C-alpha cells in the first residue's frame, strides 16, 4: 500500500495545503514517507493577514 497521496478519515475532506474552515481536514495523510496527522493552521501572509490551510502537525 502507501500510495504517494493517501488520506484517512471521512469521505470528502481537505488534503495538504488546501484551505480549511476549522474542521473538515483529513485525519491522516501519507506524505514524505510516513503517516502524518493533519490539522488546520493559519500561516502568515502579509501585514496582519493569514490564509488558513491544512498543514501537518
Amino acid at each position: 500500500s502507501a500510495k504517494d497521496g493517501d488520506v484517512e478519515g471521512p469521505a470528502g475532506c481537505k488534503k495538504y495545503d488546501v484551505e480549511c474552515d476549522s474542521g473538515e481536514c483529513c485525519q491522516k495523510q501519507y506524505l514524505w514517507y510516513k503517516w502524518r496527522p493533519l490539522d488546520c493552521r493559519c500561516l502568515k501572509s502579509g501585514f496582519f493577514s493569514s490564509k488558513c490551510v491544512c498543514r501537518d502537525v
Binding site: D39, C40, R41, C42, L43, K44, F47, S49
Partner: protein, 1323 residues
C-alpha cells in the same frame, strides 16, 4: 572686541567694500575713489531701486544688524564698472547659489547609479557648470592677492581643488593616478548649508577637532607604551599550534635529525578539527589550550590568525592590535586567542588596557565633544534671545457633549487602545483557527468604536473645533485608513494599507504622561536632531562613494583570495553594499571589514577604516550624546522595665562598637570565598565537602544570634522599615529554611545557600569613596526605570513591525552537515523533505513578539546582528528556500531601528548617570544645590588657600663627596638628561621583531649593557645626595627596583632559576619607568589640564571598578550553580566555561563589555539534544534552560553594561568640566603647586615668612595667571599685605592677596566683591 575693532578700520583705511547684500540688497559701492551712493546712515530710499531697498536692508540692520551682510572684496583692480560689474551682480543673486546647489544634488544622484555611456557625457556638463562658477567669483574678486579675495575663504578652497582634480582626470593629464577621482565627492560637503540651523553643528564639529589635539598626542603616547608592552610578552605567541610527534616508523625515516623539521613544517601534521577554517591555538601553561594526546604545542609554524593580521610580532602589528583593544571591536576574539595560548593570568594585560584605554581615554574624547557643543548652543541661545527681546440639533449636542467632554469616555477609549495594542502583539506565525478568529473579529469591533467616537466628537464639539487640536486630526487619519482596510478588504494592493494599523500604537502617547513628556522634547528641539542626522548620513555618503571608487574593483578582480572563492556579504562592490560596510564602522565595528579590504587590496584600507571610525563613531556619535544632554537633561511593670531595658542597653552598646562590626564583616568575607570554592571538582575533594557543610551550620547560628542582637538594638519599628535589614532578614529565613529541610530528610536547596553574597554589599558601601558611587545608583533607579518602559514601548513598534515582515521566513533546507542547500536543488519544503534533508529554522527569528524582542536586543548591542540581517535579506516567502542577497532593501528596516533604538534610547542611560552624578558629588562636598556655577568657582579657590602649606627643601648634606652628590642630583640639566635616556632605552625595545637574528639580537644586547651601567651611576648619585628622601618619590622606587633586578641578572648565573629571576618581569620594569614623562610636560597646557582631571578622578574611578568586581563575583557564584554542567556550543568549550570560579571570571569580564553575549546565549539556553539529569545514578545532565539563560544575561547586560560601565563616563565628564572651568576663569590645582615651588627658594627651611625686599623679587618669578611683572611695586602698594613686626610677611597674606588680583583683572561684574565676601566668612 578685536574683530569688530577691525570692522570699519580696514574698511575705512585699507579698503572698503564694493557692494553689500542683506535681504535683497543688490547695490555696488566702491572704495570711495569713484564710489556711487552707498549710504551715510540716513537710511534713505530716494534715488535708485537697489538703494531704495537698501533702506529695507538697513531696516533689517535695525533688528538683525550683523547676520547676513555680504562683505565684498577690496578694489585692488581699478575696476570702475567694467564687465566685472556684471560678475559682481551675478555672484550675489539668490538664484546663483540656488543653481549651483541643485547641480550638486543632481550630480550626487548620478554617483549612486552604475556607470554607463551617458555617465561620461554628464561629467563633461557638470565640470563646465562648476568652472563658470569659479570664473565668475574670480572675475568678481581677486584670486588670493589682496584680502577678501577668492582663495581667502575656506569653502572656496574646496570647490577649487575639486575642480582642478576633475581637470586632471577628464582631460588627459598625467594618465596614471585614477585614485583622485574618488575625491570628487567632497564638493557635496557644501550641501550642509541647506538645512536651517547648520552653523551650530558645523561649528561644534570644527571646535571638537581643534580641541582634540592634545588628547591625540596623549593617546598616541599610551598606545605606544601598551604596544611595546604587548610586543615584549606576546611575540611569537599567536603562532602556537599542536604538532604531531615524530614517529617510530613510517614514511619519514627513523633517524631523528633535521628530518624532524621536515616533518614538523608539514601542514598535515598540525592539529585541526574537522570542518574548521583556522588552527586552534594551545599553550603549555596551566589553564591554556591543552593539545590532544599524541601532540605538542610548538611555536613558529604557519601564520598568525586572521590572515596573519592579528599578531604581536612586529611593532606595526602590535600597534594595530593594541588599538582594536582600546576601540573594543571583536576584542573578545583577541582576548580568547591570547588566554588560550598564554594562560588565564594574562587577564591582567587586558584589565589595564581596558581601564586606561577605553574607560578613561575614550571618555576624555566624549568630554571634549560635549564641551564643544555646549559652548556653541550657549552662544546661539543668547544670540537668539537678544533677537527675541436646529431645535433637536442643539438639544442632543448638550447631551452628546455631556459624555464626550467628561473624563470617563476618555477612560474607555484608553482601555480599548491598550486592548488594541495587545491584539496586534498577539499576532504570530502558525496560529490555530479559533485564536486567529478572535483577532479578526476584534479588529471589526475596534474599528467601529473608533468611527463612533469620531462621529460623536464632531457633533459634540464643532466641525470647526474638531480640526482645531492636533490630536483630533491624528485620530481622524486613523479612521480614514481603517475604512480603506475594510473597503479594500479583498480587492487588491491591501498590503500597504494595513501597515497603518501601527499608528494606533502612538495614540497611547496622549493618555499616559511619561511617554507624553518624552514626545514633547522631540517636538520642542527637533531641528537640532535633523542637523545631526543629516550630517551623519552625508559623511556616510562621502565615505561610501570614496570607498567603492577606491576599493571596488579589487573585490571582483582578486576575488580568489576569499576562503570559498566568492564575495562576502559585506564588500565595496556597488553603492548599497558600500553604504552598509561604512555604516557598520560608524556603529563601532571596523576591523573584520578592514581585514578583507587589505587581503584583496593594499595598505590604503588602514587609513580608510580608521578615519571613518574616528569621524563617525568618536565624534558624530558623541555629538549626539551632547545633544540629548542639552535637551533631555531636565509584676509592677517598672520592675521588669528595668530588666528589659538593660537588655537593650547591652545590645545597643554592642551593636555600635568598632570591633564587633569588623568581626561581622570578617566572617562575611571569609565565608564568601568558601562559596567560590564549590566548583566541578568539589566531589572528589572529600575534606572540602565537610568544611562546606560545617560553615553552613556556624552561619545559620551566626545569622540568628546577630539578628536577635540587632533586634534588641534598633527595635521592631526600625528593623523592619530599612532596606538593609530586609536584606538581612531574607538570609536568616533562607538559612533557617535550609536547616529545617536538612533535618527532615530533604537535601538543601543550593540556590538559597548562595543568597549570603548579597550581605556583602553593606560593608562595600563603607569603603572610602563609595558613597558618591552607590548614591548615584540609588537615585538613578527611578529615572532609568522610566527609560526602560519608554524603550519597551518604542521597541514594541519595531517588534510588531518585524514580526509582520519576517515571521515564518527564516526556514531553510539544510544538509547532513548543517550546510544550506542552494536553490536549483531545493526550492521549497516539498523538495527538501522529499530527499530526506532537514528543514530547519534559525534560532534567532521574528516568529512572535517574544522572539522579536530578543532579536532586536541583539542588533541594538551589535552582537549577533550579522546573522539576523543575513536571514532577513535572504528571506522571500513562507514555504520557500531563501536565496542569497535577494530582499536587499530590508537593510533599511535595520538602519531606522539602530538610529532610533540604539543611538537614541540606549544613550539616555549615559544621560541619566551624568546628571545624577553631578548633583550627588555636589551633595557629598557639603555644597549647596542652589549656587549657580560661578559662586562655586570662587568658593573653590578660597578653600585651597586655607589648606595650603609651604613645603620644605631637602636638607643638603655636608660630607666629603656628598656635596656634589646633591649639586648634580637637583639641577634640571641632569634630570632632563636622564629622561632622554629613558625614552631612548624604550624606543630601542620597539625594533624588536619576531625571528630577528643572532647578530641583530647581540647589537641590542650590548646597548642594554650600556644603559644599565649609566642607570647604575644615576642611582648611586641620587641615593648619596638624597639619603632617605630618595624613597619619597614613587618613580624613584621603580628606578631603584629596576637597577637592582638588572644587575642581579647580569651576574648570579649559577642560580636554580625556574622563572625565579625571569626576563619577563625585567621587561615590564623597563617600560613602566617611562611614566616619568607624565610629570614633566607642563608647558603643554592642554595635556597638563587633562592629566590633572584624571588624577583627581582616580579614587572614584577605582570605586566604580571595585563595585564592578563584586557584581562579577555575585554572578560568577550564581552562574557556576546554574551552568556548570552544559554541553559545548558556540562559546562554551574546554577553556571558556562556568566550571570553576576563575574560569567564570574570564567569561563575566568579557561579557561586561557586552562582547560575545550571543554565543554565550546559544549554549546556556540550549534545550535540545541534551540529557535529562539522573539523580539516583550520579549524573547531572548537560541541559541548559532558556528561561533562566534569558533572565541571567539580560540582567547582566543592563546592570553591568548599560549602567555601571556608563558610570565611568559620568565620573570623567564631571571632572573635565571642573578642571577646564578652573583654567579659564578660576585657578587650577597645579597653579597652587607652582606658588610653593617658587616660595621655597625664598625660604628653604620653610620658615613660613619672607623678607619684604624679597617680595618684588618673588612676583617676577611667578608665572601667570599669578605673576605681576615690572613695575610691580605700585601694584604691591595696592594689595596692602599686612606685615608682622619684623618686616617679615606670612605666606597666606601674599597668597590671599594674589587670588583677589586674579579675580579682579579677569571679571568686572560680580567677581571682586563675591570673592572678598567669601574670604571673610571662611576666616
Amino acid at each position: 572686541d578685536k574683530g569688530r575693532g577691525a570692522n570699519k578700520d580696514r574698511d575705512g583705511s585699507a579698503h572698503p567694500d564694493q557692494a553689500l547684500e542683506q535681504g535683497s540688497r543688490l547695490p555696488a559701492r566702491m572704495r570711495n575713489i569713484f564710489p556711487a551712493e552707498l549710504a551715510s546712515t540716513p537710511l534713505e530710499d530716494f534715488d535708485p531701486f537697489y538703494k531704495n531697498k537698501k533702506t529695507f536692508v538697513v531696516v533689517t540692520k535695525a533688528g538683525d544688524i550683523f547676520r547676513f551682510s555680504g562683505e565684498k572684496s577690496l578694489w585692488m583692480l581699478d575696476p570702475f564698472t567694467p564687465i566685472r560689474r556684471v560678475a559682481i551682480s551675478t555672484m550675489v543673486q539668490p538664484i546663483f547659489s540656488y543653481f549651483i546647489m541643485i547641480t550638486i544634488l543632481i550630480h550626487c544622484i548620478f554617483m549612486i547609479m552604475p556607470a554607463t555611456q551617458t555617465t561620461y557625457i554628464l561629467e563633461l556638463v557638470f565640470l563646465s557648470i562648476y568652472t563658470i562658477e569659479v570664473v565668475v567669483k574670480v572675475l568678481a574678486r581677486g584670486f588670493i592677492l589682496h584680502p577678501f579675495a577668492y582663495l581667502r575663504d575656506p569653502w572656496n578652497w574646496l570647490d577649487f581643488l575639486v575642480t582642478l582634480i576633475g581637470y586632471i582626470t577628464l582631460v588627459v593629464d598625467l594618465g596614471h593616478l585614477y585614485a583622485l577621482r574618488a575625491f570628487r565627492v567632497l564638493r557635496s560637503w557644501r550641501t550642509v548649508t541647506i538645512v536651517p540651523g547648520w552653523r551650530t553643528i558645523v561649528d561644534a564639529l570644527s571646535l571638537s577637532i581643534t580641541s582634540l589635539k592634545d588628547l591625540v598626542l596623549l593617546l598616541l603616547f599610551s598606545l605606544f607604551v601598551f604596544a611595546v608592552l604587548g610586543l615584549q610578552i606576546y611575540m611569537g605567541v599567536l603562532t602556537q599550534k599542536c604538532v604531531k610527534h615524530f614517529p617510530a616508523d613510517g614514511s619519514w625515516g627513523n633517524f631523528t635529525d633535521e628530518r624532524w623539521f621536515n616533518y614538523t613544517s608539514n601542514s598535515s601534521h598540525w592539529y585541526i578539527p574537522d570542518d574548521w577554517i583556522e588552527y586552534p591555538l594551545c599553550g603549555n601553561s596551566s589553564g591554556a589550550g591543552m593539545c590532544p594526546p599524541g601532540y605538542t604545542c610548538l611555536q613558529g609554524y604557519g601564520g598568525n590568525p586572521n590572515y596573519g593580521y592579528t599578531s604581536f610580532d612586529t611593532f606595526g602589528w602590535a600597534f594595530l592590535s593594541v588599538f582594536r583593544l582600546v576601540t573594543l571591536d571583536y576584542w573578545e576574539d583577541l582576548y580568547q586567542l591570547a588566554l588560550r595560548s598564554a594562560g588565564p593570568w594574562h587577564i591582567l594585560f587586558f584589565i589595564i588596557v581596558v581601564f586606561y584605554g577605553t574607560f578613561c581615554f575614550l571618555n576624555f574624547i566624549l568630554a571634549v565633544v560635549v564641551m564643544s557643543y555646549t559652548h556653541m548652543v550657549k552662544r546661539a541661545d543668547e544670540e537668539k534671545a537678544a533677537e527675541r527681546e436646529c431645535v433637536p440639533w442643539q438639544k442632543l449636542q448638550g447631551a452628546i457633549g455631556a459624555v464626550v467632554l467628561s473624563p470617563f469616555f476618555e477612560l474607555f477609549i484608553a482601555v480599548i487602545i491598550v486592548l488594541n495594542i495587545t491584539f496586534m502583539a498577539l499576532d504570530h506565525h502558525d496560529m490555530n483557527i479559533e485564536f486567529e478568529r478572535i483577532l479578526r473579529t476584534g479588529n471589526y469591533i475596534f474599528t467601529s468604536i473608533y468611527i463612533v467616537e469620531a462621529v460623536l466628537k464632531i457633533i459634540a464639539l464643532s466641525p470647526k473645533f474638531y480640526f482645531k487640536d492636533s490630536w483630533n486630526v491624528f485620530d481622524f487619519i486613523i479612521v480614514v485608513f481603517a475604512i480603506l482596510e475594510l473597503g479594500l478588504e479583498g480587492v487588491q494592493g491591501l498590503s500597504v494599507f494595513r501597515s497603518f494599523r501601527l499608528l494606533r500604537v502612538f495614540r497611547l502617547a496622549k493618555f499616559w504622561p511619561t511617554l507624553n513628556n518624552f514626545m514633547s522634547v522631540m517636538t520642542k528641539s527637533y531641528g537640532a536632531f535633523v542637523n545631526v542626522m543629516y550630517v551623519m548620513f552625508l559623511l556616510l555618503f562621502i565615505f561610501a562613494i570614496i570607498g567603492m571608487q577606491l576599493f571596488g574593483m579589487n573585490y571582483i578582480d582578486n576575488m580568489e583570495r576569499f576562503p570559498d572563492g566568492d564575495l562576502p556579504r559585506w564588500n565595496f562592490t556597488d553603492f548599497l553594499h558600500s553604504f552598509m560596510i561604512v555604516f557598520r564602522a560608524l556603529c563601532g565595528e571596523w576591523i573584520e571589514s578592514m581585514w578583507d579590504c587589505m587581503l584583496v587590496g593594499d595598505w590604503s584600507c588602514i587609513p580608510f577604516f580608521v578615519a571613518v571610525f574616528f569621524v563617525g563613531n568618536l565624534v558624530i556619535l558623541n555629538l549626539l550624546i551632547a545633544l540629548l544632554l542639552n535637551n533631555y537633561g531636565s509584676a509592677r511593670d517598672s520592675s521588669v522595665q528595668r530588666m528589659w531595658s538593660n537588655i537593650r542597653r547591652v545590645c545597643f552598646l554592642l551593636a555600635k562598637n568598632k570591633y564587633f562590626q569588623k568581626f561581622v564583616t570578617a566572617v562575611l568575607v571569609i565565608t564568601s570565598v568558601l562559596l567560590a570554592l564549590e566548583d566541578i571538582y568539589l566531589p572528589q575533594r572529600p575534606v572540602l565537602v565537610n568544611i562546606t557543610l560545617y560553615v553552613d551550620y556556624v552561619l545559620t547560628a551566626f545569622f540568628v544570634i546577630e539578628m536577635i542582637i540587632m533586634l534588641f538594638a534598633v527595635g521592631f519599628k526600625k528593623y523592619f522599615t530599612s532596606k538593609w535589614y530586609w536584606l538581612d532578614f531574607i538570609v536568616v529565613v533562607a538559612y533557617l529554611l535550609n536547616f529545617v529541610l536538612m533535618c527532615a530528610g530533604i537535601e538543601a536547596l543550593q540556590t538559597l545557600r548562595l543568597l549570603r553574597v548579597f550581605r556583602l554589599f553593606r560593608p562595600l558601601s563603607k569603603v572610602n569613596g563609595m558613597q558618591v558611587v552607590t548614591s548615584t545608583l540609588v537615585e538613578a533607579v527611578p529615572h532609568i526605570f522610566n527609560v526602560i518602559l519608554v524603550g519597551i514601548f518604542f521597541w514594541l513598534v519595531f517588534a510588531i513591525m518585524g514580526v509582520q515582515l519576517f515571521a515564518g521566513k527564516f526556514y531553510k533546507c539544510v544538509d547532513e552537515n548543517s550546510t544550506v542547500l542552494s536553490h536549483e536543488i531545493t526550492m521549497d519544503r516539498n523538495d527538501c523533505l522529499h530527499e530526506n534533508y532537514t528543514w530547519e529554522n534559525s534560532p534567532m527569528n521574528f516568529d512572535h513578539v517574544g522572539n522579536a524582542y530578543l532579536s532586536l536586543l541583539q542588533v541594538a548591542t551589535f552582537k549577533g546582528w550579522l546573522q539576523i540581517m543575513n536571514d532577513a535579506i535572504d528571506s522571500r516567502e513562507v514555504h520557500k528556500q531563501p536565496i542569497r542577497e535577494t530582499n536587499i532593501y530590508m537593510y533599511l528596516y535595520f538602519i531606522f531601528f539602530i538610529v532610533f533604538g540604539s543611538f537614541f534610547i540606549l544613550k539616555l542611560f549615559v544621560c541619566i548617570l551624568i546628571d545624577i552624578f553631578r548633583q550627588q558629588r555636589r551633595k557629598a562636598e557639603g555644597l549647596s544645590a542652589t549656587d549657580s556655577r560661578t559662586q562655586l568657582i570662587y568658593r573653590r579657590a578660597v578653600m585651597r588657600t586655607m589648606s595650603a602649606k609651604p613645603v620644605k627643601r631637602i636638607p643638603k648634606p655636608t660630607c666629603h663627596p656628598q656635596s656634589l652628590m646633591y649639586d648634580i642630583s637637583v639641577n634640571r640639566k641632569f634630570e632632563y638628561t636622564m629622561m632622554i635616556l629613558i625614552i631612548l632605552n624604550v624606543a630601542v625595545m620597539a625594533i624588536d621583531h619576531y625571528g630577528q637574528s643572532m647578530e641583530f639580537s647581540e647589537v641590542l644586547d650590548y646597548l642594554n649593557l650600556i644603559f644599565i651601567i649609566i642607570f647604575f651611576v644615576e642611582c648611586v648619585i641620587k641615593v648619596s645626595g638624597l639619603r632617605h628622601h630618595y624613597f619619597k618619590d614613587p618613580w624613584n622606587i621603580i628606578d631603584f627596583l629596576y637597577v637592582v633586578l638588572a644587575i642581579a641578572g647580569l651576574m648570579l648565573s649559577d642560580v636554580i632559576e625556574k622563572y625565579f629571576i625571569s626576563p619577563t618581569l625585567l621587561r615590564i620594569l623597563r617600560i613602566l619607568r617611562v611614566g616619568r614623562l607624565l610629570r614633566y610636560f607642563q608647558s603643554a597646557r592642554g595635556m597638563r589640564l587633562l592629566l590633572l582631571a584624571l588624577r583627581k578622578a582616580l579614587r572614584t574611578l577605582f570605586n566604580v571598578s571595585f563595585l564592578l568586581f563584586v557584581i562579577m563575583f555575585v554572578y560568577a557564584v550564581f552562574g557556576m550553580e546554574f551552568f556548570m554542567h552544559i554541553r559545548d556550543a558556540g562559546a562554551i568549550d574546554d577553556v571558556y566555561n562556568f566550571k570553576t570560579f576563575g574560569q567564570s571570571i574570564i567569561l563575566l569580564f568579557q561579557l561586561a563589555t557586552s562582547a560575545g553575549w550571543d554565543g554565550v546565549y546559544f549554549a546556556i539556553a540550549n534545550e535540545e539534544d541534551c540529557r535529562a539529569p539522573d539523580h539516583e545514578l550520579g549524573y547531572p545532565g548537560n541541559c541548559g534552560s532558556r528561561a533562566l539563560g534569558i533572565a541571567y544575561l539580560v540582567s547582566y547586560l543592563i546592570i553591568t553594561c548599560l549602567v555601571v560601565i556608563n558610570m565611568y563616563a559620568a565620573v570623567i565628564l564631571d571632572y573635565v568640566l571642573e578642571v577646564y572651568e578652573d583654567s579659564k576663569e578660576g585657578l587650577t590645582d597645579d597653579d597652587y603647586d607652582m606658588f610653593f615651588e617658587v616660595w621655597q627658594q625664598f625660604d628653604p627651611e620653610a620658615t613660613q615668612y619672607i623678607r619684604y625686599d624679597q617680595l618684588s623679587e618673588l612676583l617676577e618669578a611667578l608665572q601667570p595667571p599669578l605673576q605681576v611683572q615690572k613695575p610691580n611695586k605700585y601694584k604691591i602698594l595696592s594689595m596692602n599685605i599686612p606685615i608682622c613686626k619684623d618686616d617679615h610677611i606670612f605666606y597666606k597674606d601674599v597668597l590671599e592677596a594674589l587670588v583677589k588680583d586674579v579675580f579682579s583683572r579677569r571679571g568686572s561684574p560680580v567677581e571682586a566683591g563675591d570673592v572678598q565676601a567669601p574670604n571673610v566668612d571662611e576666616a
